[PDB]
């Protein structure tokens, strides 16, 4: 009958500089022979060709396809991706959402610490030097 495809992880949260691997799978019979990945944009969905910007990779087998995105970018990579599998009896699609965490959120306990140290030094240095 018609194929039924689903994502392994419906939502992921990776960071820039790394490489996200989204994967769809299916267990219908006949198996899904061909897979196609699209990135959702406003009013239109753009196909993801292998080798694009020397950073995209697609590895497809019967009923399973991995989308590798190298060098996560904060501007174009985050969003919604649709995987579509077309078996001889029809086709199906799944939606995966990808977010890119940056170094702003990554180096949070470094700035936090140095800010607290600065505040403490200023507080004590006014509380004693001139106030006391």
């Amino acid at each position, epitope marked *: 009958g018609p194929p039924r495809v689903k994502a392994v992880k419906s939502s992921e949260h*990776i960071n820039e500089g790394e490489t996200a*691997m989204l994967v769809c799978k299916s267990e219908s019979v006949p198996p899904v022979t061909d897979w196609a990945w699209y990135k959702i944009t406003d009013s239109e969905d753009k196909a993801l060709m292998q080798g694009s910007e020397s950073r995209f990779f697609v*590895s497809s087998s019967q009923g399973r396809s991995e989308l590798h995105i190298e060098n996560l970018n904060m501007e174009a990579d985050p969003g919604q991706y649709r995987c579509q599998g077309t078996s001889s009896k029809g086709s199906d699609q799944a939606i995966i959402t990808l977010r890119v965490r940056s170094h702003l959120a990554a180096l949070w306990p470094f700035l936090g610490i140095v800010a607290e140290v600065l505040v403490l030094v200023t507080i004590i240095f006014i509380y004693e030097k001139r106030r006391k």
Partner: antibody
Amino acid sequence: QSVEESGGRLVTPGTPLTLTCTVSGFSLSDYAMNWVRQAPGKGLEWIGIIYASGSRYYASWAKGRFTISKTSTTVDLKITSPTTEDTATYFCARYYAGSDIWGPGTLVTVSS
Amino acid sequence: ADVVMTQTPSSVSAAVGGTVTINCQASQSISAYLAWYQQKPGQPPKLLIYDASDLASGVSSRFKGSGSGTQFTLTISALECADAATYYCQSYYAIITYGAAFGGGTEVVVKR
């Protein structure tokens, strides 16, 4: 669905050597193939992988020391300069989700 | 940089019918892309669990993989004497960039 390695033997350090993994029951253009080695009484070392499209990726420690290629029915693994530290059993494995189908493995000994 | 897998403990024992757990720690976030293998002496490894939780085909329910991120854990229950073997974890998260390094191994000894 099964695979069978061949080409294991004794060789002198430096002499190149080519191992062959023959698949059976599926085409090499619809599945990737991994090459994994295991020294006597040690763990498994992942050597490399050849995808269906033909792209080949090798492990960090094994860059340059090996070479993977493939024909329509067999996958070949060439060792350019075997060392004494290269004696191990070599398995070929079909990559779908992890490595499901594995081969019996062939033993490669490098000694004088 | 290749992802390195830190499999602990090295050895684990339990009585017939008990339950064992094994933890694998990934050097970085690998999401749920960890496979577990059971290698008996001499024979080739056998895939037990893929995607960190899905059971392989024809595998008993006694094996249960759990975890995500960087921490994973395999658990066996009603330990039979046929479970004596070495178990290995393996990451396959974006192999083209981090490789698929294997774990150190976990010798499971049954206590009769």
